[PDB]
Amino acid sequence: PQLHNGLDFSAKVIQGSLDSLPQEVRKFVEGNAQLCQPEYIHICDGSEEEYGRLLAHMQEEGVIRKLKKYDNCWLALTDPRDVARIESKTVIITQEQRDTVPIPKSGQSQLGRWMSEEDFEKAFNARFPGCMKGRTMYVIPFSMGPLGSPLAKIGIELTDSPYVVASMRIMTRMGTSVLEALGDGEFIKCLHSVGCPLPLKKPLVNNWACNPELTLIAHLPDRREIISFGSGYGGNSLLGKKCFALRIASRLAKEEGWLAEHMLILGITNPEGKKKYLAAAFPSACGKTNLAMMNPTLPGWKVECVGDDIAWMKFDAQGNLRAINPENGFFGVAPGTSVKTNPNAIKTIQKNTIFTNVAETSDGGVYWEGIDEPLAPGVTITSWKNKEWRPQDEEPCAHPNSRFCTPASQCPIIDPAWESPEGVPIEGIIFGGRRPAGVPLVYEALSWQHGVFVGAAMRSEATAAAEHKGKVIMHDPFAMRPFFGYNFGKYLAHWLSMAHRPAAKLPKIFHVNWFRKDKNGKFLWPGFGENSRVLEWMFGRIEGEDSAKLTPIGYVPKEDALNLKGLGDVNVEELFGISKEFWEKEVEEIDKYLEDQVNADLPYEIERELRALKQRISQM
C-alpha cells in the first residue's frame, strides 16, 4: 500500500510492535514520528522490567541519580529555568476567545489564556518539526482512572523524555493492558517534546534538556489534543496530571454532565463506625496532602485517602455524587513534608519514589526545608543546584516547588475504595483558603447556590513566585484558577445546574480556614491533626445535627459544639469572630473582581448571592 516506505516507522521500533496498535493509535504515532523525526520509537508496555531498565539507563546516561539510602528511590535535578508550570505559556485554543475565558474589563485575564488557532499553528510549526532528532519517542498508553471504570478516560502520550515515562508509570495506569481496553475507542492525543533536538545547539544545564524560550503548553479541547513543548517539568510534561485531568477533562465534563475538579477525596470514619467521603478544594500548598492523609487527634476517628489532588465526579442513578481519583500516584510538594506534619506521606515515599529538585545528603538520602529531621554531625547536604549547602546560605537546599512522585498504593491509609470503578459517594464539599484575617475557622453554606458563590469567591494567601515577591492574597475560585478548560462563568453555570437534577443528593458545602491570626500575629488554630475536630462538626451537620448558628456568612458552630478539649485556651472570640467592617470590604472586593474578570458571563444566581450577602452584612 505504498510507493516507497509509506509512513512505516517499523525499522525504528525498539520495543513493541506497530502492527499490534489500534489503527488510530498507529496513525497518531507515525504521523508524529514523521513530524518530530525521532531516532527511535519505544511502545511502552508498563512492565516492571521496562521500568527498571529505563531507570538504570537514565542512571547510566547521567539523567537521574539513585538514592542509595532507600529502596528504589531516585533523584532528578533540573535546569533552574525549568522548575514549575509557566502560566503565561499555558494556553487553550478555541474558535471563539469567550468560549475559553471571560473577556476581562481591564488588563489580562486571571482565569484563562486563549490563543487563536492561527497563532497556535504558527507557534507549532516553529517548534515541533524535527524536534526529536537523535532521541527516542516513547508511546505511553495510559488510563486516567481505574481501567474499565465507566468514569475512566484513555490517552496516548508521545514524549522524548524517559523521566516523563517513569513519572507517568507512577502517576497513571500505563502499558499494554490500556491498549487492550482502548481498542478502537476515542483517546486524548498528548504530544510532548523537551524541544532539544540533537545535536544540541546550546549546552545542557544539570543534564536536563529543556527549551525555556520556546516553552508552550497548549490545549485543543475540540480536537482532544494536548501539545506541550520545551519543558520537562511536572504539569508541563506529565500530561495526565493537569492538562488532561483538569483542563481537557473539565471541558468534556461540561459537555457530558460530570465534573473535573481540583479536589482531594478522603473517607472519614467516626467512633461509631459511620463513614463518609468528603471532597476538598484548597489552593495549592494549603495542605491538600495534609488533610487527605491526616492522622486525626480525636480518639476513634480515622481518615483514609482516596486522592490528594484531582477528583472526577458524576451523579449515579440513585442521585449520589460519585467521585473517583483519576490518578495512580501522588506528585506532592516536598518542602514542608515531615514526620510531624505528615507521617503518612513520609511512610509513602520511603520506597519506589522519584524525587525532583530536592537536596541530597552524603548518606544518599533526601532533604528539604521543613523536613524536621536533624542529620548526624558530618552528614553534608548537596542542594538541588548540585552545590554544597549550609543553612547559613540565604538560598533553600531544595527548590520551593520540588516534588516527590510516589505510587498511591504505598500510602499506609489509602482507602480500600480508592480504585473502586463506581467511585465514592461525596456527602460534603469543602472549600478553603489561607486567610490571616477576617475569615473564621469553619462555616457552612446556606444553600447550593450560596455554596457555589462561596467557591467562586475563594481567596488565599499564596507564596509569591515568579509573578509576585512575599505572600500575596489572590482569588482562586474552586482552587481552579490556572486550570479552567473553558469560560469560568459557564463553569459556575454548570455547577449551579446541579441543583436542578431531580433526586440529586447534593453534598453539604463548607469553607475552612486553618490560618487565621490574632491581633498580634499568631495562629489562632493549631491545625494538622486537630483539624479532625472541624471534620467532626461537618460530619454531624451532614447527619442534620442541631449544632449550627446562623450568621451573615453562613452557619457556624454553636458555642461549645466543637470538641476543643486538650487544646488549652482557644481564643474563640477572635477565631470565630465576624467583623462587619472586614466583610463589607470583602464583599466590595469580590464585586470588583467578578465585574472585572467575569462581567457578562457571570450567572445571575451568583450576582444574587453577592447581593444577598451584602444585605445580610449591612444589617449587622
Residue numbers in the entry: 3 to 622
The authors write:
We have recently reported that PCK1 activity and stability are subject to a strong posttranslational control by acetylation, phosphorylation, and ubiquitination in response to cell energy input. Thus, the ability of cytosolic phosphoenolpyruvate (PCK1) to perform its reverse reaction (from PEP to OAA) depends on its acetylation level on conserved residues close to the active site. By applying several biophysical and biochemical approaches, we have found that acetyl-CoA promotes the self-acetylation of PCK1, which occurs in the absence of a lysine acetyltransferase.
Analysis of the crystal structure of PCK1 revealed that chemically acetylated lysines were not localized in a specific region of the enzyme, but interestingly, we found acetylation of two lysines inside the active site, K244 and K290, with essential catalytic functions. To analyze the consequences of acetylation of these sites on the kinetic properties of PCK1, we used a previously described method to generate site-specific acetylated PCK1 variants at positions 244 (K244AcK) and 290 (K290AcK) in Escherichia coli ΔCobB. In both cases, acetylation of either K244 or K290 resulted in an enzyme with residual activity (≤1% of controls) under saturated substrate conditions. To gain insight into the consequences of acetylation on K244 and the mechanism of chemical acetylation we crystalized the PCK1 K244AcK variant and PCK1 WT in the presence of acetyl-CoA. However, we were unable to obtain a complex between PCK1 and acetyl-CoA. On the contrary, we were successful in obtaining the crystal structure of PCK1 K244AcK. The structure showed that acetylation on K244 prevents the coordination of Mn2+ with this residue, but interestingly the acetyl group of K244 establishes a hydrogen bond with Arg87 in the R-loop, which is essential for catalysis. These results indicate that acetylation on K244 affects the Mn2+ coordination and also the interaction and synchronization of two essential loops for PCK1 catalysis, leading to PCK1 inactivation. During catalysis, K244 is essential for the coordination of the manganese directly bound to OAA. According to this, site-specific acetylation of K244 prevented manganese coordination and established a hydrogen bond with another catalytic residue, R87, which explained the low activity observed for the enzyme.
